C-alpha cells in the first residue's frame, strides 16, 4: 500500500505550517557522529585541509509523530531533507562553503524520528606543517549551531571515537587518531551554554 | 495525436501524488550499466581520478502504466527526469560532486518502465601509482542506494562488462579491463542485504 504512506506524508507536511524552530520552552537535542572517509588534499601555502566525511545527525521533534496502525502499520519512511526542518550544524573554521557529495534524504520514524547522513567535502583551517614527519599534525574543526544557544539546541555525541572503518585504504594520509568530543562554553557576560562538538584528527603522509 | 500525448502526460503527472519511494512491502529493482568514455585526469598529489561515463539506469513502476488504446496507440514518451521520481544511486567514494554532461531526460513505456542515461564526470578516490608501468593500475568505485537497503531497492546488472565500444581512442590513459560486478553485503547486527554495483577499471598510459 503506497496509498497509506502518501496519506501520512500529506497529513504531516501539507496542512500544518512548517515547524518554527527550537524555542527555550521546547528545546531539542541533536546527536552528531562523523564517519571520516578521506584526507584528500593539504595546502601549505594557505593552511587549509580538505576532508571528505559522512556527518550523521539525529534530533527529535513532536510534529512528526503518528501511530503506525492508523496508517497501516508504517513506522518509518524516507523523505527529502527539504521537506522537514533540519538543524544548522555548521563547521566554524570552514573556508569554502561545503559541497554535498550525497543525496539529502532523511528517514523518519513513528516515534517522530529523523535521521540524516549527508556526505560532504569540507575545506577548513588547519596548519599542516610537520605532516611529512613520523609525528604527524593535528587539526581541529568544531561543528555547532550558528544561531541557537545551548538552551534551545543541545548536542550529544554517541561515541567519542570517529568511525575510521571506511577511510580510503590507499589515501595519501594515514590517520593516527580522531575524536568527536563535546565541548561547552560559558562567557562572563552571559549565563547561557554555548555547545559544540570538536573533531580533532592526527594524520601524516603514508610511508 | 500530440493532443493524445499531452493528454497522457497530463494524466500521469498532474493527476496524482508523487510516488513516495519504494518500501519493504512494495520494493523495486534498478538495472545499472556503465558505458565508459574517457579517463580524463589523474593526479598523484591527491589520489583522485576523473571519469566521464554514461550510466544507464532502468526501473519499472506500476503508477506509470497506461494502456495505449486509451491514448491513441502511444507506447513511450520522453519527459524531463524532473517530472518523475528517480533512484538514489550514488558513487560511494566520490570526492567532488558529479558534473552532468548531458540533458536529464528519461523515456517511459506503457508497461511503466523508464530508462534514463545521464552522461557524467566523476572524481573519485584512486591511487594512480604505477600508471606508466605496463601492469597499469586498478581503480574502483561502488554505486548504490544512499538510503534504501536491499529490501527496498535491488540492483542488477545485465552484463558485467563495462561498455568500451565508445572509449576515446586518443585519451591519455587506456582501459585494460572494466567490470560491473554486483555485490551483496550482510553484517551480523542486521538482517538486511545491502547491495552495490562495484565498478573496477584497470588502465595504463599509451604504450
Amino acid at each position: 500500500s503506497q496509498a497509506n504512506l502518501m496519506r501520512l506524508k500529506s497529513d504531516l507536511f501539507n496542512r500544518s505550517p512548517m515547524y518554527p524552530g527550537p524555542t527555550k520552552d521546547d528545546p531539542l537535542t541533536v546527536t552528531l557522529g562523523f564517519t571520516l572517509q578521506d584526507i584528500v588534499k593539504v595546502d601549505s601555502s594557505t593552511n587549509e585541509v580538505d576532508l571528505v566525511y559522512y556527518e550523521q545527525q539525529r534530533w527529535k521533534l513532536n510534529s512528526l509523530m503518528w501511530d503506525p496502525n492508523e496508517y497501516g502499520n508504517i513506522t518509518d519512511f524516507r523523505t527529502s531533507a527539504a521537506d522537514i526542518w533540519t538543524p544548522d550544524i555548521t563547521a566554524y573554521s570552514s573556508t569554502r562553503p561545503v559541497q554535498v557529495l550525497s543525496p539529502q534524504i532523511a528517514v523518519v520514524t513513528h516515534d517522530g524520528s529523523v535521521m540524516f547522513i549527508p556526505a560532504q567535502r569540507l575545506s577548513f583551517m588547519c596548519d599542516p606543517t610537520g605532516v611529512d614527519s613520523e609525528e604527524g599534525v593535528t587539526c581541529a574543526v568544531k561543528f555547532g549551531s550558528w544561531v541557537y544557544s545551548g538552551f534551545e539546541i543541545d548536542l550529544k555525541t554517541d561515541t567519542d571515537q570517529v568511525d575510521l572503518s571506511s577511510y580510503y585504504a590507499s589515501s595519501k594520509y594515514e590517520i593516527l587518531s580522531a575524536t568527536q568530543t563535546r565541548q561547552v562554553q560559558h562567557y562572563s557576560c552571559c549565563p547561557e551554554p554555548y555547545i559544540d562538538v570538536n573533531l580533532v584528527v592526527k594524520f601524516r603522509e603514508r610511508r | 495525436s500530440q493532443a493524445n500525448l499531452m493528454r497522457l502526460k497530463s494524466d500521469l503527472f498532474n493527476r496524482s501524488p508523487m510516488y513516495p519511494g519504494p518500501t519493504k512491502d512494495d520494493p523495486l529493482t534498478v538495472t545499472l550499466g556503465f558505458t565508459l568514455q574517457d579517463i580524463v585526469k589523474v593526479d598523484s598529489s591527491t589520489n583522485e581520478v576523473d571519469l566521464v561515463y554514461y550510466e544507464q539506469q532502468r526501473w519499472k513502476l506500476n503508477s506509470l502504466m497506461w494502456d495505449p488504446n486509451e491514448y491513441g496507440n502511444i507506447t513511450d514518451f520522453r519527459t524531463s527526469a524532473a517530472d518523475i521520481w528517480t533512484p538514489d544511486i550514488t558513487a560511494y567514494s566520490s570526492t567532488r560532486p558529479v558534473q552532468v554532461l548531458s540533458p536529464q531526460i528519461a523515456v517511459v513505456t506503457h508497461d511503466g518502465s523508464v530508462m534514463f542515461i545521464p552522461a557524467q564526470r566523476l572524481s573519485f578516490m584512486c591511487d594512480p601509482t604505477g600508471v606508466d608501468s605496463e601492469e597499469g593500475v586498478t581503480c574502483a568505485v561502488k554505486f548504490g542506494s544512499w538510503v534504501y537497503s536491499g529490501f527496498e531497492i535491488d540492483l542488477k546488472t545485465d552484463t558485467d562488462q563495462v561498455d568500451l565500444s565508445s572509449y576515446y581512442a586518443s585519451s591519455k590513459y587506456e582501459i585494460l579491463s572494466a567490470t560491473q560486478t554486483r555485490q551483496v553485503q550482510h553484517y551480523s547486527c542486521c538482517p538486511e542485504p545491502y547491495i552495490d554495483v562495484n565498478l573496477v577499471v584497470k588502465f595504463r598510459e599509451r604504450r
Partner: peptide, 16 residues
C-alpha cells in the same frame, strides 16, 4: 560495522 555505511545507519537508530 554498520555505522560506516549510511544506508545501514539510517535503518538502525537502534544501534547507530
Amino acid at each position: 560495522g554498520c555505522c560506516s555505511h549510511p544506508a545501514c545507519a539510517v535503518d538502525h537508530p537502534e544501534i547507530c
